[PDB]
Design a protein around this ligand. Structure first.
Ligand SMILES: COC1=C(OC)C(=O)C(C/C=C(\C)CC/C=C(\C)CC/C=C(\C)CC/C=C(\C)CC/C=C(\C)CC/C=C(\C)CC/C=C(/C)CCC=C(C)C)=C(C)C1=O
Lengths: 365, 231, 46, 70, 108
């Protein structure tokens, strides 16, 4: 109703990658003015499934930030385009932030969604405060067993023809071809019947996706290319102890390799204590996994997100002075010294808070 | 969040979580009168009364420096009992300790009293510091009340009582103003008041309501970085 | 003693930025505690 | 800050006026010279030697209490 | 003979009961003054201090107060048997009789 507001639209196939618009759910915060958080769901996965996580009083995430559960191109209700270049998909978010008048946002993602979130910070860092990745890493996952199943299932989904196939023929096809219960349920709910019951189809572009995965090259979603670069801002990674997607042994190094400010395990990278279970990827379902992600998420949003690199926490804003590099300012008659870096308002561009407070400051003097 | 995984963490050669009688080679063995000529032992049956007199001394010798503060004498007593009640409430089986837990604890409390007799026990110096900071804050409230001025604590109570009325005037569907709802209201005010101390409220914006305070700042000419270089 | 300020930049407000003005006092406060010991030891040393 | 620094300030009161009020705010090399030799409180004025004694005094004194309390 | 009371030095006063009725009233006033005592009006001559929220360590604080008000020197061997109001009353009498017959205070 009010707290939950998801804009409604129809997907549009686009020939130009720049004329792509993103659509998703918006969760209003408890308080009037709060920074915004943009969260990307797993590929082919529903945004609604994350609502109980972000709408739980025990976690109270909306008390911190407004949440935009946004779908990337070719997913959900967003526009469709064959290219999956993270640079192109990142520009889509920048236009969405512009159309929605968002100066800078906190980015999050689950699995492959985490890659999309981190790519935006890699391509647009000046407008991203932080990144929170869940069971993902900026890494090539083409040869991970978890990805192969997803890559394999999507290929099986290309065999069904809704026009000829009946409703029962589909249900039998999924149970036999899809073994994972969660993926099966996710895919079933992604099937929709267009107006006038003309025919049933998948909400996501099955053709463009299978080609990306089946080709299994740099543009594949499982792959993380060197072209994507480095993320300069705050980044926190949380994944299960026994996870098929992120192996604790070596899959943590890409974080140090790609994220410059990542300190390491125990500070910006954590693992949730758990057993071996293929369903641990979906932390929002299990309270034990979710409670830790929420606590760590609230800690990242409250103390670490949107904090200058050389500062430890948000507590140091206004009391810790950073050294200055010589000959870094235009003024020639400037005595170089330590300074507290400037932290700006989350939407200072599309509001006039600075112009307003300047007047109030004059009234004091 | 994180639980110990090793199941044998509390295992000892003497059993599970045994911190009263650790296993050692020279184990206690009995003595027989008919076969025993002489013996050298320090164990006695005087630990009970020493446990009583030690309490009376540690209590009476600490009150010498309380200046008749009745509220402090009663608080100190509760803390003194917590120190003597450790053997009675601990997981450690104090009645099964190696060579007598009674003598062990009594001899330990005697070392604490020796420091108390000199007024050098860290609990004493900690009690003086804690109490002086409390009275300085209570006297500040008294001085502000005698002047008819309003205390920062009463301003919060009055600001919270009126907010409860505003929140319950719209809570008509339900009528259970839970303690949870009352709490988040108070914490929200505390967080804004907490940030107000370092950045007071100049205008209607309120405490810590100026964005310009968070722009680039510099140390004042009269107080530079004394500990390190600046550039 | 008063220190001459070139006034090249405005100093932060002590109320809004108080921690910046504290270090100077605590440094002398340390020395005063040491002096109390020097004076108290006049009879022992003497 | 310490008493010895305060003694310098009383002696350098007129020197502080010349360098800070007049020179520091000029332009050119005369300004760079005044702003460089500006008089006031010391940046990084701490004395590590004095701080070193304090640490070793406290560390060695705690050893005395253990060795002497027998 | 002086003590601090709320930061002020006050001269301490000692009592001399020498009467059964004055003892029962003093002990009750004493036990009712202790901040740990429960059911202060339910306290009578036959009240077990354990039944009013008092343990062995609280009986010590009470004995410590008897020395303050009466000037007695109570030994550690006598305190742990004071677990009822009746016990304080009978002990106080035994001390008054000892000093009235032996001319000295009991062994401390
Ligand atoms: C008693 O208990 C004990 C301790 O306390 C618990 C310990 O800490 C310790 C450990 C010891 C230490 C931690 C101290 C360590 C010190 C060491 C190793 C030596 C330190 C040496 C220096 C810092 C170099 C000093 C060099 C100079 C003084 C020469 C330069 C100064 C000059 C020439 C000025 C002239 C000085 C004089 C005429 C002396 C008169 C004295 C004054 C204060 C006059 C001052 C005058 C002015 C104008 C400031 C022990 C052993 C101990 O027993």
């Amino acid at each position: 109703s009010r707290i939950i507001n998801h804009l409604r639209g129809d997907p549009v196939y686009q020939d130009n990658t720049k004329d792509v618009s993103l659509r998703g759910t918006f969760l209003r915060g408890k308080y009037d003015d709060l920074p915004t958080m943009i969260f990307f769901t797993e590929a082919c996965d529903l945004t609604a499934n994350w609502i109980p996580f972000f709408t739980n009083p025990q976690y109270d995430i909306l008390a911190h930030r407004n949440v935009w559960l946004l779908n990337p191109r070719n997913f959900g209700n967003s526009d469709r385009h064959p290219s999956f270049d993270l640079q192109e998909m990142s520009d889509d978010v920048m236009r969405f932030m512009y159309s929605q008048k968002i100066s800078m946002a906190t980015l999050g993602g689950h699995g492959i969604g985490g890659k999309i979130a981190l790519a935006v910070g890699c391509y647009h860092a000046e407008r991203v405060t932080g990144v929170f990745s869940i069971d993902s890493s900026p890494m090539d996952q083409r040869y991970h067993e978890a990805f192969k199943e997803f890559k394999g299932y999507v290929n099986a989904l290309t065999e069904i023809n809704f026009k000829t196939w009946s409703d029962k023929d589909v249900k039998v096809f999924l149970k036999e071809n899809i073994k994972d219960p969660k993926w099966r349920s996710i895919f079933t709910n992604n099937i929709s019947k267009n107006a006038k019951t003309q025919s049933d189809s998948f909400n996501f572009e099955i053709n463009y996706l299978n080609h990306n995965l089946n080709f299994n090259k740099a543009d594949s979603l499982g792959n993380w290319a060197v072209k994507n670069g480095i993320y300069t801002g705050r980044a926190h990674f949380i994944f299960p102890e026994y996870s098929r997607w992120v192996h604790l042994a070596t899959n943590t190094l890409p974080m140090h390799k790609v994220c410059a400010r990542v300190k390491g395990f125990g500070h910006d990278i954590f693992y949730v204590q758990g057993d071996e279970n293929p369903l641990n990827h979906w932390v929002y379902d299990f309270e034990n996994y979710a409670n830790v992600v929420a606590s760590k998420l609230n800690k990242f949003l409250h103390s670490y997100d949107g904090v200058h690199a050389l500062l430890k926490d948000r507590t140091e804003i206004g009391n810790f002075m950073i050294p200055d590099r010589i000959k870094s300012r235009n003024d020639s008659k400037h005595i170089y010294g330590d300074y507290s870096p400037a932290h700006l308002h989350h939407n200072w561009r599309f509001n006039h808070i600075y112009e307003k407070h300047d007047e109030l400051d004059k009234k004091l003097n | 969040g994180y639980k110990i995984r090793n199941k044998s963490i509390f295992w000892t050669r003497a059993g599970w979580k045994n911190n009263w009688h650790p296993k050692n080679f020279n184990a206690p063995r009995p003595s027989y009168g008919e076969f025993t000529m002489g013996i050298r032992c320090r164990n006695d049956h005087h630990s009970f009364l020493r446990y009583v007199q030690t309490y009376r001394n540690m209590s009476r010798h600490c009150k010498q420096y309380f200046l008749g503060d009745k509220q402090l004498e009663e608080t100190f007593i509760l803390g003194l009992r917590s120190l003597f009640l450790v053997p009675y409430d601990s997981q450690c089986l104090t009645d099964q300790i190696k060579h007598g837990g009674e003598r062990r604890f009594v001899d330990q409390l005697d070392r604490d009293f020796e420091l108390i007799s000199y007024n050098t026990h860290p609990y004493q110096l900690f009690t003086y510091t804690v109490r002086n900071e409390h009275l300085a804050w209570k006297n500040e409230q008294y001085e502000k009340i005698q002047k008819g001025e309003k205390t920062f604590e009463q301003e919060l109570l009055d600001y919270l009582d009126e907010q409860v009325l505003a929140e319950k005037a719209k809570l008509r569907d339900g009528q259970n103003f839970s303690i949870e709802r009352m709490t988040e209201i108070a914490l929200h005010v505390f967080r804004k008041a907490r940030a107000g101390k370092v950045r007071p409220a100049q205008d209607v914006r309120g405490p810590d309501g100026n964005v310009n305070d968070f722009l680039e700042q510099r140390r004042p000419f009269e107080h530079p970085n004394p500990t390190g270089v600046t550039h | 003693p008063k220190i001459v300020n070139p006034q090249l930049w405005p100093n932060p407000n002590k109320l809004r930025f108080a921690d910046l003005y504290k270090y100077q006092g605590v440094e002398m406060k340390k020395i005063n505690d040491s002096i109390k010991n020097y004076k108290a030891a006049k009879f022992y040393i003497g | 800050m310490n008493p010895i620094q305060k003694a310098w300030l009383k002696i350098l009161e007129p020197v502080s006026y010349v360098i800070n009020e007049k020179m520091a705010k000029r332009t050119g090399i005369i300004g760079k010279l005044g702003r460089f030799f500006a008089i006031g409180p010391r940046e990084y004025g701490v004395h590590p030697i004095n701080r070193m004694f304090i640490f070793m005094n406290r560390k060695y004194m705690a050893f005395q209490a253990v060795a002497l309390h027998r | 003979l002086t003590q601090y009371v709320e930061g002020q030095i006050v001269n301490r006063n000692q009592l001399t009961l020498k009467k059964q009725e004055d003892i029962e009233q003093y002990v009750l006033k004493l036990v009712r003054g202790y901040f740990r005592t429960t059911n202060k009006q339910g306290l009578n001559i036959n009240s077990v201090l354990q039944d009013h929220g008092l343990d062995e360590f609280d009986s010590i604080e009470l004995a410590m107060q008897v020395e303050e008000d009466l000037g007695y020197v109570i030994s550690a061997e006598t305190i742990p048997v004071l677990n009822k109001v009746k016990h304080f009353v009978n002990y106080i009498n035994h001390v008054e009789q000892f000093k009235a017959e032996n001319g000295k205070a009991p062994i401390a």
